[PDB]
Amino acid sequence: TKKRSNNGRSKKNRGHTRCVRCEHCSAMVPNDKAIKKFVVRSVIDAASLDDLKIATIYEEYEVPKSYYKLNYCVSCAVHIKLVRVRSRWERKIRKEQRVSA
Amino acid sequence: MYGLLAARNLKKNRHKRRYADKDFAKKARGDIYQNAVGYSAPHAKGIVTEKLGVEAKQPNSAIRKCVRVHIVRLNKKVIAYVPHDGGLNQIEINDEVIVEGLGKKGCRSKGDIPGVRFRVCKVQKVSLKALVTKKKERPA
Amino acid sequence: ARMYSNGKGQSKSVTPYNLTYPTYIKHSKEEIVDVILNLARKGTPPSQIGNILRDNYGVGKSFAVTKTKILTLLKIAGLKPVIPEDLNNIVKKCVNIKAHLAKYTNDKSSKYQLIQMQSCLYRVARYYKSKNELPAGWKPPF
């Protein structure tokens, strides 16, 4: 029986879409189906900022950040616990997740 | 095909549909005259050539008593079942027997007997029911 | 719906309930009739005649003054074309597509458009050669 109204993907009014590759296992997954995750990570860890304050030559310094978008296939997303199995009424709830660091 | 002047189209279509029915198909396109008892004849005469026994299908546990018959009208050899309690004892090799159908729509196996399609009715011109129950005797 | 594709557009223009006589205008009957026949002899299609009469001279639908239709007036004046103007515009588009494909042979989309166009030509031809508006053995310019 049909488990989801949208077939588990975001394609509508189209024939075909570009593929992308999974970060964890390099499998091909369609772009409109892949699980997506955003990361904004400081170059320097929080446990070093108190040393940075005496190491730097400049009057003040702003740490550089690094930015990423990651893609996962279903198997990897479930195994890494980005997503979890949910009850028949919960399946319908849609909410934006946090940006990781 | 539902128009007022559409009768020819409608007729030809509906005729072609009927071949999907197994019943209509066999009568039209199969070999309906291959059988000793069937479209051809209600009963068949033949001579006994061997005595035989067969296991019942699971889950039953029995040996069923059967006879090899050479059919006069076709020169085929067929298996038939012998109905009654001590029935096999009323038949000798080279006796003549008359043989009858099991009562299904096509020729099909009945009950727990695998692959046997006819049963014995009379031996040497007399009813097998009378022979077994000792109401009458062999012609001798 | 549309004949060669999946379109269901609805853009048309409303025909009036009654037509009257355009008394607000600034020319006579005979002047309007002269304007039409001049534009005709210069070689304009009758749909363009209609556009000019509305836009420049200020007359809607070009019939309220004349009690006669544009193509009928051109037949009365003897200015009738050799081929009806619709069938004529279909042959032109075919020629254009064949002239493109002649130099850009690889274009599968243009090939697709040509077979649609060609079908439409013969469907129109069969109309006119039933109403005796074309000779029975007329064939495309190709």
């Binding site: - | 128009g3 007022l4 | 025909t15």
Partner: protein, 128 residues
């Protein structure tokens, strides 16, 4: 294009189910007029106005509380006077009430008038 007499029927059937009292029907022909005029004679509909829009035509009608259902038959079968009671028993709910309408050389008539005038015709539609 849809059949105009079919369109008429679905338009009034749906509006009746939705408990509306009046409707506008958008494409009208000669027999559609005569059908509506029949329903008025037997008191199934109350008021009729016709709009002469120069684009086909349209009608505005008031429904009564007595109308349960109506329908067109397609195609329009030819019937002898011997045949009409067969169709009467197939279409109508009771022997006591309701109308089966037939076209004839004497206009639209009902299954009782067929007996009076001694004429068959072509089957058109029904209401009860």
């Amino acid at each position: 294009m849809m059949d105009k007499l079919a369109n008429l029927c679905i338009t009034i059937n749906n509006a009746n189910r939705a408990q509306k009292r009046s409707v506008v029907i958008r494409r009208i022909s000669k027999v559609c007029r005569l059908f509506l005029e029949s329903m008025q004679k037997h008191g199934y509909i109350t008021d009729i106005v016709y709009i002469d829009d120069h684009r086909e035509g349209k009608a505005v009608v008031g429904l009564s509380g007595r109308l349960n259902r109506c329908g067109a038959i397609c195609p329009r079968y030819d019937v002898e006077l011997k045949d009409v009671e067969r169709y009467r028993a197939n279409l109508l709910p009771s022997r006591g009430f309701g109308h089966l309408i037939v076209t004839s050389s004497k206009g639209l008539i009902d299954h009782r008038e067929c007996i009076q005038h001694n004429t068959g015709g072509k089957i058109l539609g029904y209401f009860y």
